[PDB]
Amino acid sequence: IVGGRRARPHAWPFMVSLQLRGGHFCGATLIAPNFVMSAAHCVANVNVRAVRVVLGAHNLSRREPTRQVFAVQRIFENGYDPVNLLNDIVILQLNGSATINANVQVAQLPAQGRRLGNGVQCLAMGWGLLGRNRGIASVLQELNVTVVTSLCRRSNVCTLVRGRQAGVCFGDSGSPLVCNGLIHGIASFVRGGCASGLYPDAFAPVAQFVNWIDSIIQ
Amino acid sequence: STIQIPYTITVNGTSQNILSSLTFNKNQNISYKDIENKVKSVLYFNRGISDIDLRLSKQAEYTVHFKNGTKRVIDLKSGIYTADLINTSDIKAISVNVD
Numbered sequence: 001i002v003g004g005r006r007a008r009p010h011a012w013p014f015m016v017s018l019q020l021r022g023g024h025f026c027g028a029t030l031i032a033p034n035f036v037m038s039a040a041h042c043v044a045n046v047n048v049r050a051v052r053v054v055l056g057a058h059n060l061s062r063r064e065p066t067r068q069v070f071a072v073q074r075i076f077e078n079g080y081d082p083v084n085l086l087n088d089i090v091i092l093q094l095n096g097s098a099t100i101n102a103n104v105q106v107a108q109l110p111a112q113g114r115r116l117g118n119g120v121q122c123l124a125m126g127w128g129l130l131g132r133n134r135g136i137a138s139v140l141q142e143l144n145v146t147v148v149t150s151l152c153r154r155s156n157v158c159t160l161v162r163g164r165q166a167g168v169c170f171g172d173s174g175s176p177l178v179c180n181g182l183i184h185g186i187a188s189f190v191r192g193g194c195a196s197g198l199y200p201d202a203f204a205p206v207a208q209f210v211n212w213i214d215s216i217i218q
Numbered sequence: 219s220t221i222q223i224p225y226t227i228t229v230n231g232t233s234q235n236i237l238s239s240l241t242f243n244k245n246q247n248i249s250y251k252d253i254e255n256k257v258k259s260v261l262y263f264n265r266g267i268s269d270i271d272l273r274l275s276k277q278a279e280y281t282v283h284f285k286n287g288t289k290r291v292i293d294l295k296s297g298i299y300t301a302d303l304i305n306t307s308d309i310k311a312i313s314v315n316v317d
């Protein structure tokens with residue numbers, strides 16, 4: 001997240017860190033105690049048996065005892081198109097059920113098919129790069145964004161920060177976009193580098209997938 | 219603490235008939251912009267293809283081959299980047315293709 005701020009400790013208890021050999025590489029969202037939601041391109045090329053799913057984290061450089069750490073047992077996709085970056089969503093089933101407490105909680109999803117109009121105010125977050133040259137964030141970051149429809153496409157939710165150069169960056173893929181208390185996007189891709197200020201960040205549109213997500217938890 | 223990652227360069231159907239590799243940090247999570255920076259440097263150094271020449275080419279892509287047998291094809295003229303990081307020790311090879 002370039003040009004955001006630090007989140008309050010544990011303000012988003014559904015925020016997930018996917019890690020490989022102790023190193024964060026993508027975000028995710030806890031959507032049931034044994035399921036997380038991320039971007040399909042985050043796992044298309046990794047050995048999924050080696051991914052650690054870290055819940056209840058805030059400062060990734062420490063050993064926070066509020067953490068719950070799981071392995072991935074199975075993945076579910078639904079039409080992922082890597083060439084066109086369509087349907088960029090994956091559900092990861094965990095090898096266990098998380099214990100729900102103040103630090104670890106399940107996110108709420110919108111109704112199926114709800115579209116967000118131009119101008120809607122949202123909150124993006126993640127542990128990605130603090131800015132190119134500056135390295136990965138240790139403490140979870142959040143960023144106020146606005147939904148835009150120009151320079152976008154119907155199969156994505158796009159967002160823009162105006163007046164300054166700010167947006168998601170590398171390592172923020174899979175992280176949630178929160179609007180009106182609901183998870184409305186999964187961070188997918190940027191155009192012309194991080195925080196260009198010209199092109200909106202692109203999210204996978206979670207509202208298009210709600211019936212499918214529900215069928216997977218059953 | 220570093221690892222060699224082999225690469226090949228193909229320009230208009232002609233390869234280079236060389237064994238050569240790039241130097242990465244072992245077990246580091248890097249972006250596709252980091253990888254692009256290294257693909258562009260070997261293009262310039264081994265084939266004389268600068269940023270300007272890459273922009274003016276008809277097609278330009280590179281493929282990251284992963285050790286689990288999958289691959290990822292990146293279009294060097296798209297300006298689109300997924301916001302992920304990938305681990306250097308998971309990469310088998312890189313192949314660059316400029317027509």
Ligand SMILES: *[C@@H]1O[C@H](CO[C@@H]2O[C@@H](C)[C@@H](O)[C@@H](O)[C@@H]2O)[C@@H](O[C@@H]2O[C@H](CO)[C@@H](O)[C@H](O)[C@H]2NC(C)=O)[C@H](O)[C@H]1NC(C)=O
Nearest residue numbers: 021048049050051052053068069070071072094095096097
């Ligand atoms: C579910 O899996 C977690 C994580 O397992 C670790 O990470 C995996 C990616 C893989 O590399 C495993 O071999 C690792 O052990 C389990 O958490 C581990 O639990 C064991 C026993 O309690 C403990 O020795 C490890 O230190 C734990 N690892 C971490 C990172 O906390 C967890 O127990 C599994 N849950 C169930 C119900 O089996």
Ligand SMILES: *[C@@H]1O[C@H](CO[C@@H]2O[C@@H](C)[C@@H](O)[C@@H](O)[C@@H]2O)[C@@H](O[C@@H]2O[C@H](CO)[C@@H](O)[C@H](O)[C@H]2NC(C)=O)[C@H](O)[C@H]1NC(C)=O
Nearest residue numbers: 011120121122123124142143144145146178179180181182
């Ligand atoms: C930046 O966002 C914060 C957080 O609010 C969340 O994101 C919003 C865009 C919208 O999705 C809210 O429903 C989310 O809860 C905004 O802080 C909120 O501000 C309103 C108005 O003052 C207040 O009633 C809420 O309690 C605040 N929520 C929290 C969690 O603090 C903030 O206003 C946004 N900044 C700008 C400049 O719009």
